[PDB]
């Protein structure tokens, strides 16, 4: 079972957040409570609400007047809308399956939650009046002179995050993508480095795949040895 969030990355203050979560490989989806949770930076998880296939929803009482969850059973995919966004709402938004086990008559309450057992990876939501900006990607060439470190410098993007893969996901060993720095300009930059065998520097092509969903931009940058 896999859950995958999609969101806009950035919401303007006072505007409405719209997120979705696509569920794959669940063979009894109608049994479960499809849930949204969020987490402000450095703070606790906060339950937002859930929905069942019968359409029944429940919501956090402090957020109820601002939120709505909906469910498209044909995919299946469920959604969150949250009105009147402000910086107080910036954070990571997770979808989750609050799985249910049924032991008797549902109308007599003979069922229980197993727990929120499958989680999405989260979608970052930043509330700001600033414009989205995609990254500029520069190669960090390997030392000319065992192992060598090479990488990509991902400069000047907003909002978070960027994700970085190498060779379209074929290269995972030795990859270290560092958390971003926030510049005085209000843009972020980060670096992703991979430690590779020196003998491969002649033979193996290395490409960092930098995805910035908020700007609908992906950059695949070839990283070659220094001239």
């Amino acid at each position: 079972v896999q859950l995958r969030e999609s969101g806009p990355g950035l919401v303007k203050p006072s505007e409405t957040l719209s997120l979705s979560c696509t569920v794959s490989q669940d063979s009894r989806p109608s049994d479960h409570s499809w849930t949204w949770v969020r987490q402000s930076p450095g703070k606790a998880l906060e339950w937002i609400g859930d929905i069942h296939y019968n359409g029944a929803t429940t919501y956090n009482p402090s957020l109820r007047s601002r939120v709505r969850i909906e469910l498209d059973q044909s995919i299946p995919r469920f959604s969150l809308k949250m009105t009147s966004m402000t910086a107080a709402d910036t954070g990571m938004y997770y979808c989750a399956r609050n799985a249910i086990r049924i032991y008797g008559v549902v109308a007599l309450g003979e069922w229980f939650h197993y727990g929120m057992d499958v989680w999405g990876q989260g979608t970052a939501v930043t509330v700001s009046s600033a414009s989205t900006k995609g990254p500029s990607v520069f190669p960090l060439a390997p030392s000319s002179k065992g192992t060598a470190a090479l990488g990509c410098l991902v400069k000047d993007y907003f909002p978070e995050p960027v994700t970085v893969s190498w060779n379209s996901g074929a290269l995972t060993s030795g990859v270290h993508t560092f958390p971003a720095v926030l510049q005085s300009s209000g843009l972020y930059s980060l670096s992703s480095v991979v430690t590779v065998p020196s003998s491969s520097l002649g033979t193996q092509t290395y490409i960092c795949n930098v995805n910035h969903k908020p700007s609908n931009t992906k950059v695949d940058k070839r990283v070659e040895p220094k001239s």
């Binding site: 998880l45 906060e46 429940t58 919501y59 470190a149 410098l153």
Partner: protein, 205 residues
């Protein structure tokens, strides 16, 4: 609301106990989750019916017990329930579990000079990448030749790695002329009273 202790510290091999307290807990089941920095939560105590993790109920408190604690158990632990009236669900405030006695680890430092491509775009960034240090505190100083750099430095807070060591990044912004004007630049990383210094030079390959 559900209340948890902010922090629990234990040594390796010992048993940790984390409490969750609240009015709903007398009648509503308490689920437990673990979340490591940079990761989504993981369910660790489910309701299986009407191996190191277990939970025990007593009145308004449920206790999570972790047997045989090891460094890989460092994480934030959250309890979760529903209110007595069956109207909503809620999480506790979380407990950070610290495992004592982890050995110190010195930082590895990699310093990259500006790329030719960036210089042609009229910018220059030196990239100092710092990894595998413990505890999670470093200080970073930059030098142009032998003189301290007073501007253009941006350094991240340390972040916890998957191996429970920490990482940080420091960037120095220069104009291309400044980069070419000095014999070398250095990133100097101090941790636990000792320092690793890496240098790069415009005329060097």
């Amino acid at each position: 609301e559900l209340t948890q202790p902010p922090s629990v510290s234990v040594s390796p091999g010992q048993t940790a106990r984390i409490t969750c307290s609240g009015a709903p807990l007398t009648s509503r089941f308490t689920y437990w989750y673990r979340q490591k920095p940079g990761q989504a939560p993981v369910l660790i105590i489910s309701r299986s019916s009407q191996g190191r993790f277990s939970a025990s109920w007593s009145g308004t408190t449920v206790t999570l017990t972790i047997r045989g604690v090891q460094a890989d158990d460092e994480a934030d632990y959250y309890c979760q329930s529903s209110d007595t009236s069956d109207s909503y669900k809620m999480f506790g405030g979380g407990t950070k579990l610290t495992v004592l006695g982890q050995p110190a680890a010195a930082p590895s430092v990699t310093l990259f000079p500006p790329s030719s491509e960036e210089l042609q775009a009229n910018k220059a960034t030196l990239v100092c990448l710092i990894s595998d240090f413990y505890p999670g505190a470093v200080t970073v100083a930059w030098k142009a030749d032998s003189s301290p750099v007073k501007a253009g430095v941006e350094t991240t807070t340390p972040s916890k790695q998957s191996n429970n060591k920490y990482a940080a990044s420091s960037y120095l912004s220069l104009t291309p002329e400044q980069w070419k004007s000095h014999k070398s630049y250095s990133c100097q990383v101090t941790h636990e009273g000792s320092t690793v210094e890496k240098t790069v030079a415009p005329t060097e390959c």
